[PDB]
Amino acid sequence: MQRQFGAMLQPGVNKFSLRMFGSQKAVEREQERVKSAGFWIIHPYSDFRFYWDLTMLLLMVGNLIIIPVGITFFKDENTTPWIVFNVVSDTFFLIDLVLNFRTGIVVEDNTEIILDPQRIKMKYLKSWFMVDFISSIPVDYIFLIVETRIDSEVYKTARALRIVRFTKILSLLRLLRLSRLIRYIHQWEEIFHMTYDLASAVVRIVNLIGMMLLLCHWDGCLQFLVPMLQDFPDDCWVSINNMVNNSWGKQYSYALFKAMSHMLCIGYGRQAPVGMSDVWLTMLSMIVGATCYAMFIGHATALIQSLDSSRRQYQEKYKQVEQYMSFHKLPPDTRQRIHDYYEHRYQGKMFDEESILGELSEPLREEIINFNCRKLVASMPLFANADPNFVTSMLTKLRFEVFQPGDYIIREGTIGKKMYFIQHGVVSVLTKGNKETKLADGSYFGEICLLTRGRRTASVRADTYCRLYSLSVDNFNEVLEEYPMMRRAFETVALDRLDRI
Amino acid sequence: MQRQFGAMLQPGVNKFSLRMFGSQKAVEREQERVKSAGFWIIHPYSDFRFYWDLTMLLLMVGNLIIIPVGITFFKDENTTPWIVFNVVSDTFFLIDLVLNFRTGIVVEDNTEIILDPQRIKMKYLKSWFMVDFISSIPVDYIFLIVETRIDSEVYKTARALRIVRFTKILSLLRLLRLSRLIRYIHQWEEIFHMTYDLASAVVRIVNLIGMMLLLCHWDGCLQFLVPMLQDFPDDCWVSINNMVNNSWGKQYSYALFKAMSHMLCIGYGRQAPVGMSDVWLTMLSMIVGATCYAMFIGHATALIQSLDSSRRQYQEKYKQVEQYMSFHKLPPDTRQRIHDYYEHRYQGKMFDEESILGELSEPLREEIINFNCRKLVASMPLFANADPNFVTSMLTKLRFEVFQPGDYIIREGTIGKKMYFIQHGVVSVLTKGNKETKLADGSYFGEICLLTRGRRTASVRADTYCRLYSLSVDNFNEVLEEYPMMRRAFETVALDRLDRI
Amino acid sequence: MQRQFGAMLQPGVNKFSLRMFGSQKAVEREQERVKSAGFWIIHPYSDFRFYWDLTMLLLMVGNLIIIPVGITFFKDENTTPWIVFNVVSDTFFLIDLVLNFRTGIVVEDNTEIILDPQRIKMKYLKSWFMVDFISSIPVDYIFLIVETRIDSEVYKTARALRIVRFTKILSLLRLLRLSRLIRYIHQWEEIFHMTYDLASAVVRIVNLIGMMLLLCHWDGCLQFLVPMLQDFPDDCWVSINNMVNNSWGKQYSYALFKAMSHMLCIGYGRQAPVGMSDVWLTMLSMIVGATCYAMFIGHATALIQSLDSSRRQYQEKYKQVEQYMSFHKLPPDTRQRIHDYYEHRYQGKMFDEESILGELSEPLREEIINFNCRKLVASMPLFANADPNFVTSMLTKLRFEVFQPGDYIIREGTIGKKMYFIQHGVVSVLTKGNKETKLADGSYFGEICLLTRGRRTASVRADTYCRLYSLSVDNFNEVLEEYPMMRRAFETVALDRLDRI
Amino acid sequence: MQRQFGAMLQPGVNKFSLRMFGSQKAVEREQERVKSAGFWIIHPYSDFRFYWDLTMLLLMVGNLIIIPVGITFFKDENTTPWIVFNVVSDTFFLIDLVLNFRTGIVVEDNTEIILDPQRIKMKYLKSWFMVDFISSIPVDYIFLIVETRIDSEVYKTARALRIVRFTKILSLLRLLRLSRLIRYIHQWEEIFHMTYDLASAVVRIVNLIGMMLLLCHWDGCLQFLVPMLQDFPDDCWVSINNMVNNSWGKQYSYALFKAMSHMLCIGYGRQAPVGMSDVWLTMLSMIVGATCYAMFIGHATALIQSLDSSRRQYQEKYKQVEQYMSFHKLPPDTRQRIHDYYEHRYQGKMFDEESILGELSEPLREEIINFNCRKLVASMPLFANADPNFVTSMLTKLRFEVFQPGDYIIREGTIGKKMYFIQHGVVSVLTKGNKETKLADGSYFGEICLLTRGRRTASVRADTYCRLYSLSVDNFNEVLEEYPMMRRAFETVALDRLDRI
Ligand SMILES: Nc1ncnc2c1ncn2[C@@H]1O[C@@H]2COP(=O)(O)O[C@H]2[C@H]1O
Ligand SMILES: Nc1ncnc2c1ncn2[C@@H]1O[C@@H]2COP(=O)(O)O[C@H]2[C@H]1O
């Protein structure tokens, strides 16, 4: 199954490969560049590297939680389940150390991905090797075997206690897997799409909350560890609180409380620190916890300032309108009319709709505008019996407008520059010496002046909260220069409306 | 009164229905869609649902305040007023549970409101049912009746104490009414208009302050509850502080203090926590309180950064002007003149007046501009004896300008492109070889070049802080192409001013 | 001196009256509206009201600092200096209470200031009267005189102690002068110009720091007051700390420390609170201090986010340029050239110079642009021997540009659309088959194509970091259509440069 | 070597002199202005002043760390190494005091640098002299010599102890070197280029973290100093904790802990403060620490809100698109197509590319656009065999567009206004009654209508995610009016494509 076990190392066709490479042909050329690279090269955008990084993330979170508790609180932490756990974990981390010499490297100086194993080897030895080589191999068990072979009869003196304490210090080199944890979390969050579509403040504050929990855990383990490597002297907090002979659950609970009282800014344990190890560890935890909590307030502020974005923009613009009205001292009748205007026109959410449609492509503009005006097209007798290209070319030129009742849309006897379609509401056509006529949805008005370039023949007044679509002269002549056969519909309607007067 | 008691379930005509549906005809079609739906369907934007949600909000705030204090601090909390209160409340919550199977559901995937009771039933069973069914029914009294019927003679053993403690745990399922509290507060704040016109930061921080008070209250009740369900062991804070036999007022006061010392970041009660229940509850309250206080700092920051919005924009723009002047190293005479210019021209509040008027409709622009220039129209002899359509079409084209004294507005013998009306201040017309003439409010100048396309015949210098209105050539020719009969007024004035020279 | 003592009540000519009214004639009409109002009406923008508010601010800060310390810590606080101080202060506050019935009221619904004493009386009785009438009159001394006259022989029982404690509670009604303090600080900071030119975040955080100091002071006085009105019971912190018989300096110092430990989030005094007065006062101070400190963090954040405004804008735009270069993966040669371009062109501070000049008036634009190009005008032989109107009309059309060395400004044989003046640097004119010629400051190039509409006759390459001024074709033809006599200078230079080839 | 030791005092040619003066000729004129100034004038932008300020920064950080610990914790701090250290440091600070009378002063009111030694002397005596003259000279050793000479036999009384304590107070005048530290850090960070290219929030928070460490250090020294100058009374924290006779390491560690518990908001030392010196010093440290920590939260917030700038802008704009789609209730098919459109078109980072290219100069625009389209130019047969001036003038006019598959790019029989080049993807040309033809990279389409002004002859539909370059009609006619010889290539291709139909 060397074909099946070789297809996982190359970037398969998905949403991510079709996002990062362009089209499927670039994905195929990338796969051909992978297959010709060498002996089993791992592409970083592949399927094996992704789920391998995910299993290593789960294993690193398990190790960085378990390992300090196993080192500090347990006395002879060399039983068979502990050594089996450390050796299985270090087996996986040596496997990942070896596979990092076969992984393509995404470099932010080239559009391509480095797949030459010599450059991969030199760049991986250049920056992130020594910390991964320290963190992968079991340094403590190597040291125990070396100390066994140098002196076989060494475990009967006061040197042996020093060797056990130095073993418990060397076994904390596995906490250098935080580097691989941070790198694999950043790569995984860049690749995995549900965290990619999230807001960056949310992903950033989840990373911070994870790091705060991890540092509070490690700090509690450190608060117990440094008095544990001193035979619990009479001034450390353990011997003062008489927690030397409790269970490890109570020791870990009170040590985590003593660390957490300095992370979330409370303080202290039972008393003030007394011994110098206590004072300097407490000041270390106070620095780390106050920095992490200041960053937590910073991320909470940056998250809260980006929640109700368009509603906040609407309220900022309407607050500027309020301050404009107060600055020019408008009467409260007009202020009430403007309050009703902004709550009818924008409906609480203000959009830069021109820029939003300008970012989109042409068929998406055509599709959205055909969707947003389907009630108009269904209601109007003209658009329902016309060319859909003509309907779309007309609807891309319209402008949404809202008129309060009583407003004069068109004044009788001025030079007209717009043409109105009615989406919603009714209007009253007032003509001097004639009866007013109501117009409703689907009906349009103000088209004789766009055909004849004369002056307005009849005033038009609103009756309800009218929602109209305006059309300029230039766009109307442009769309009729596209389609001169639909001009005769407006000429028929305008001749009939001149016949009514 | 089935007509009167059926008109409340449908959305009546108000500001909210005329905002959310369009006009009154859409409200009537919505009411006809409600009346044809089925057996007593409740519309969510109606009048019954609104005030029913308001009474349920008052009842839930009362329940979530009272119920934990009644469970934790009182010993045999099964007297008649307590059971009457629980049964009346659970009656109201079962009524609201039943009415949620008849309420229209506003879904953010359709412009319509779902009124089909089958879809209402399936969607309500889909997400928010199990928590409301747990929180509505009295689980504890059902459990007491079931335990009574299984064993009648059960209340004489050590099982009975366990049944009483399990009753006090099951009675905390009424604290799952926080879900209905949060949902009904969000719907009520969306509907009720005085919180709708508020800034979203204010409504958001009021919701947070309510939740902080509620979590501090529940946390104090929890800090007493977990030692109360352990017969007050000798390491809990109650038996250490000898508060086992105090009144419930003092127990609740000190428990609320012990919770609140961790909410507002102070710490602790009398001593450090000792027992493991104390340590883990204290760390729980430290997480909850530090998170709520970090969010409180975040909302206070987001509120404070949006208070004096246009004044902050004015000071940002003037700070950029200050840094421009310092970057180009302007002499302090010009810096003083620019400081006086920005404090005369904008008067401390800077508005994007072009965009503010561009968002408004046409009659509101006409009405605001007729208001802001009524001193000019009353002062000028031309505008007070003219067509109000002409006055409005002229005033929409003017541009407000401010000139410091000594400034040359018009230099003698250049090609003129603007025309100035005087709102406030006096100017000196200087002509080579002739006497200067003062012009005051209502008088205009710079109009011969807009009629003749020649060059400027006389320089004009300011005398005070002049507030003028400028008019371009193109707008002047446009407005006279509208109204060619008002051209003769300017031709008469220009012929008289050429006659003066 | 009724003329001299009547000129202070009306707004004199200053920067503030010439800012808020327009010109000096509006100030004179305002003074005539003041003088005709009635019996000694005080204008709110005057000189008497300003310095009267300032003396009342100093007196209120003195009273709100001194009065709680005098009430709480001193036992029989009825010696002659204390009563003289209270009676002199209440004399001033009754004077200000009376003068508030003669002060003009600035209302944010009218451009005018209300000077009718009936509307002043009704509006002042409407909102801010009852709190000022309580805070001005001595309620405690009136109560002592009334209690003296009801029972002369009352000071020999247990009623007398209750009357003394009720006197010390009634004397805290003078702490309702905080309302007048807040109102007069807001009016004074609006009027006084050195705080008006300050950034609003600075003034706002100074107001907050003042309020935080005042609430910490009052809270320390309250922490001592409530145990002082209980004969110091055995569970209050005073009798626990044995501070009942200390001096008042030590009592005030430790009470202010006990309040301040809850304002700046530290906690506590010597121990936890024990009595219920201690617990509820400590929770009150924890609410007040945590709210004030969250607002202090909010104002510090809003202040810090607006300090290096144009430098922050430059670094935001250059960070976007960096991310553009990294997104398109530009080679590091071009990235170094763009880094040098942004550090030569903008010099670390990026200005929206088009908008900054567009906000200014015409003579200020002319004056700034004549200042910023005086080295060019002094260096060029053309501008130093020309019409200053021509120089200014040319300099308003120029555009500043920066070219790195090696760049081809003009390529030989293209259609030219710009004309370059050299402010700084030297260029090499390269012509096919001819020798290169250096051009230096004052010399201009690229003008034959603007006179002849042909194609470029010679390439031009930069030699140093050239700072040039570009001039478009349209502006060049516009300025020569203004002044056709300066065309012959460019025609002479262009004929000479064609003669050189 | 007076030439070599005189070249360091003048600004040499580097990136900084070529940034701040313009070109190398202005640097040479600045050097000639330096050399003619007087007896050894130091230019502030030179090389000697920079590294002299750097050595003084290192020496001031050393002094402000060491000096308070040497004064407070050591008893008879007058051994030979301490006096040698103070005298060597004060020698360097007197040297810097003298050299400040020879340093050019950058004033923010002139483009030039003041090098007149009279103005340098008067301005340096005007503002920053008295604090530098106090901080430079050893006041304590002068006082000891003066007290020795006034009374030789003075060191045998109770006056001598007062003289030693007054010596330890006068020796804290060396802590006024913080002024020179702050000024030299601000000048050094303005000059040194790696901190100049940093974001200002990073430099500002590094300055704040340095000041917080320094104030925590000085506050710990003060917390020990004020009980040290009182013979350790029985109520200070030293005699309560029995730390009077510990080593100075333990005294400094616990004093720094007692200061730091109030800086990072924890509190307290062993108990509450008792003596009045303890209470007022603790309240001083609480003010200073709470202010510094509120500013630290402010700088962390201002840093975090400016990290992923273009990604945050992309997510803000796409959140506005999401709220647009939810506001108009688009069907989820179109929402999925718009999600794929924004993740193909912008790829997670949204740039204002028009403004970014508009800020750049002309050759940098030409170079970036020739880089970003080299795959197109290499792929197209036209551009690879053409004038590079023509290629660049064409590529400056193109517009990048992205079409999803299935989209109709060009509809058959409309009036065409654009011309499409294919960068990536394939399209299907559909013609009525003919076979579809695939077009791939390098091929262009939609050019017959730009040559003939007719209507579209064939529809074009996308097949993959097409990345195209559009070209308008006006730019196409402009570029062919530049180069009429490349029109015949498009005429040949269009005649061949008409021949295919
Ligand atoms: N004697 C005058 N009295 C009033 N206005 C004048 C007089 N002379 C010139 N003006 C005005 O000054 C303007 C300067 O430019 P115009 O000549 O275009 O139009 C001129 C008139 O409006
Ligand atoms: N048979 C064809 N092969 C290639 N391109 C074609 C063919 N027919 C039409 N086109 C292209 O499709 C375009 C559609 O609009 P035009 O007719 O303006 O220009 C057309 C050509 O560029």
Side-chain angles (χ1 to χ4, degrees), chain D residues 244-262:
Chain D
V244 188
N245 289 318
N246 285 323
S247 177
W248 66 272
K250 295 176 71 174
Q251 287 179 354
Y252 174 68
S253 295
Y254 189 78
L256 185 59
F257 173 73
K258 188 175 180 293
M260 187 175 163
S261 70
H262 306 100

Side-chain angles (χ1 to χ4, degrees), chain D residues 133-151:
Chain D
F133 179 69
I134 288 171
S135 67
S136 292
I137 64 170
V139 181
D140 52 352
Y141 296 112
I142 289 172
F143 180 74
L144 289 177
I145 292 170
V146 168
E147 183 64 30
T148 306
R149 292 176 64 88
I150 288 174
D151 195 3

Side-chain angles (χ1 to χ4, degrees), chain D residues 410 429 431 437 439 444-450 455-458 460 497 500-501:
Chain D
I410 291 171
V429 177
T431 309
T437 61
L439 292 175
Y444 60 92
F445 61 96
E447 73 274 16
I448 303 170
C449 299
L450 277 78
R455 298 176 69 91
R456 297 292 195 182
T457 63
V460 177
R497 288 176 178 173
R500 294 178 69 191
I501 300 168

